[PDB]
């Protein structure tokens, strides 16, 4: 043989569907299933869309978490879209992952993402201006500066022209941007990143498997948030932590649990999502060179559709969970008030009922109504404009500085049923 650099990973034939998987081999409530590669996972969701578009599963038991009741899995696009856009029926309270909430977890994790309106929107409005397209556009210079420096450093730091895309670009770019928006000093950004890596890596032995470590990390980032907030209470800065401590909701300042939970939500979401879009995007360019070539020869013209196709392809957030407030029926399956419902974005984003040629990675795809940022409505990804900009700038800086950058090993995949994570991705360039 194939054209390119000698140690590049194998290419793939674009558009090839994965074989469907016998349904007896599918166990969404076992971590072992999440350790299977993406082709088996993709074929398994294909089987569910065909044979059992709504299906019930026991909740995975990770050490120290309470599985509680199982969940109804929505794997079709139209059902995920519907559930997302009916929050009075599909509530975000008490939690948006499959496990049960506890008071101990809610101290750090009881943010607006696990609330319904009106309180959810009152909290979101504290920070929403900072994430609008017009305001995010004004930090293009900061995104460029850090991406350009990171790519240059890949070259300066690696005489052998081998690097890990995750630790050297995809991780540190979004980290810098969200932490600077929050007002966190640079010296602490890597400490924040280690904390969010553990929070959203729990169950993968390379990150953490001891619940005691998970709770110490949670306590430590909560304490960090509280201390920074205290500083900003006394001396304002033009940052989001200051906005949080200065705001009032229903006539009351936020409590220290509310501040900590809001801070944690923003840095976790900012640090544990875009990096995977970027890394899966480089993996895809490596597998599908004709797509790299077409984007590189018209970068600005294709960027809007290319970024969105990277998000559809990667589906960095695998699912979100809701809880029914009333009985419903979908596709002949009667679900009860109080039951958990899981929305599988990874599956919606391959649904043949909504996408022409879903197994084709097409950077010109238009339209592209993917649910990688969710189905829309009240909780639609706050960071979506920021993420799109982070992705577009990262790829532009790769294109300009090291246009033939390519993966040289298959990814080390995060063991997670929530985050489509890549821990490392070795790359090279000429
Ligand atoms: C490609 C990157 C990203 C993806 C795929 C992604 C995906 C998602 C998804 C699926 C949701 C839930 C939507 C729903 O429930 O309807 C969400 C919510 C959220 N995301 Fe993003 N996200 C990304 C980047 C970011 C970034 C960079 C931030 C920066 C802080 C961020 C902040 C948030 C917040 C705060 C929420 C909660 C919104 C609310 O409850 O109103 N996200 N994201
Ligand atoms: C994930 C899952 C688990 C826990 C969920 C947690 C603890 C980490 C921080 C999270 C993920 C909060 C977090 C701040 C939300 C981040 C949103 C972002 C990704 C867009 C919300 C729920 C919070 C573990 C196991 O029961 C399996 C399950 O699957
Ligand atoms: Cl070297
Ligand atoms: Cl192609
Ligand atoms: Cl250029
Ligand atoms: Mg190295
Ligand atoms: Mg600063």
DSSP codes joined into one string, 317-372: B-EEEEEESS-EEETTEEE-TT-EEEEEHHHHTT-TTT-SSTT---TT--S----T
Distance, CA of 226 to CA of 418 (rounded, Å): 27
14 touches 291 (CB < 8 A):
yes
Q: Which atom of ligand 1 is nearest to the CA of 391?
A: 1
Method used to solve the structure? X-ray
CA-proximal residue: ligand 1, atom 3 (nearest): 273
CA-proximal residue: ligand 1, atom 9 (nearest): 373
Q: How far is the CA of 132 from the centre of ligand 7 (A)?
A: 20
DSSP-based three-state secondary structure for 110:
coil
Ligand 1 pocket mutation, candidates 81, 139, 267, 381, criterion most atoms within 8 A of CB: 381
Resolution in Å, one decimal place? 1.2
* Helix 172-182 with 384-401: angle, nearest 10 deg: 140
User: Annotated binding residue at 381?
Assistant: yes
What does the block give as tokens for 133? 């397209």
343 touches 320 (CB < 8 A):
yes
Given the structure tokens 């013209």, which residue do they identify?
301
Say which ligand is closest to the CA of 396: 5
Distance, CA of 129 to CA of 133 (rounded, Å): 9
CB neighbours of residue 383 within 10 Å: 20
60 touches 417 (CB < 8 A):
yes
Distance, CA of 160 to CA of 428 (rounded, Å): 9
Distance, CA of 257 to CA of 366 (rounded, Å): 43
306 touches 363 (CB < 8 A):
yes
Alpha-carbon torsion angle 48, 50, 55, 57, nearest 10: -10
Q: How far is the CA of 165 from the centre of ligand 6 (A)?
A: 10
φ, ψ dihedrals at 346, nearest 5°: -60, -35
Q: Which residues contact 188 (CB under 8 A, 6 or more apart)?
A: 179, 224
Q: Which residues contact 328 (CB under 8 A, 6 or more apart)?
A: 89, 334, 335
Q: How far is the CA of 204 from the centre of ligand 2 (A)?
A: 14
Is 273 touching ligand 2 by the criterion CB < 6 Å?
yes
Task: Report the sign of the C-alpha dihedral through residues 131, 135, 140, 145, in that order.
Answer: negative
Ligand 2 pocket mutation, candidates 31, 61, 97, criterion most atoms within 8 A of CB: 97
CA-proximal residue: ligand 2, atom 19 (nearest): 269
Q: How far is the CA of 309 from the centre of ligand 4 (A)?
A: 13
The count of C-alpha atoms lying within 13 angstroms of the C-alpha of 397, restricted to the half-sphere facing its C-beta, is 26
């Amino acid at each position: 043989h194939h054209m390119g650099l000698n140690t590049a990973i194998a290419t793939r034939v674009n558009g090839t569907p994965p074989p469907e998987v016998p349904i007896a081999d599918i166990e969404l409530g076992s971590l072992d299933f999440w350790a299977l590669d993406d082709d088996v996972r993709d074929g398994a969701f294909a089987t569910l869309r065909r044979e059992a578009p709504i299906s019930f599963w026991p909740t995975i038991e990770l050490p120290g978490f309470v599985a509680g009741n199982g969940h109804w899995a929505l794997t079709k696009y139209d059902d995920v879209f519907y559930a997302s856009r009916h929050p009075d029926i599909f509530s975000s309270y008490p939690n948006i992952t499959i496990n049960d909430q506890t008071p101990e977890l809610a101290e750090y994790f009881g943010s607006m993402i696990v609330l319904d309106d009106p309180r959810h929107q009152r909290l979101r409005s504290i920070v929403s201006r900072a994430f609008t397209p017009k305001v995010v556009a004004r930090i293009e210079a900061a995104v460029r500066d850090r991406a350009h420096r990171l790519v240059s450093s890949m070259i300066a730091n690696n005489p052998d022209r081998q690097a890990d895309l995750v630790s050297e670009l995809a991780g540190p770019l979004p980290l810098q941007i969200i932490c600077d928006m929050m007002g966190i000093p640079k010296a602490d950004h890597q400490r924040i990143f280690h904390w969010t890596n553990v929070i959203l890596g729990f169950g993968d032995p390379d990150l953490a498997t001891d619940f005691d470590e998970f709770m110490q990390v949670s306590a430590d980032i909560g304490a960090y948030a509280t201390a920074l907030a205290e500083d900003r209470r006394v001396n304002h800065h033009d940052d989001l932590t200051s906005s949080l401590v200065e705001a009032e909701v229903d006539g009351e300042r936020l409590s220290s649990r509310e501040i900590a939970s809001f801070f944690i939500l923003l840095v976790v979401a900012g640090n544990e999502t875009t990096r995977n879009a970027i890394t899966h995007g480089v993996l895809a360019l490596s597998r599908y060179p004709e797509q790299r070539d077409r984007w590189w020869s018209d970068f600005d013209g294709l960027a809007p559709t290319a970024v969105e196709e990277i998000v559809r392809w990667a589906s960095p957030v695998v699912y979100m969970r809701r809880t029914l407030t009333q009985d419903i029926e979908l596709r002949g399956t009667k679900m009860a008030a109080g039951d958990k419902v899981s929305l599988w974005y990874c599956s919606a984003n391959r649904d043949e009922s909504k996408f022409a040629d879903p197994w084709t990675f097409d950077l010109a795809r238009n339209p592209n109504p993917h649910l990688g940022f969710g189905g829309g409505g009240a909780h639609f990804c706050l960071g979506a404009n920021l993420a799109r900009r982070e992705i577009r700038v990262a790829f532009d800086e790769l294109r300009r500085q090291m246009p033939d950058v390519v993966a040289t090993e298959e990814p080390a995949r995060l063991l997670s049923q929530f985050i489509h994570g890549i821990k490392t991705l070795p790359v090279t360039w000429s």
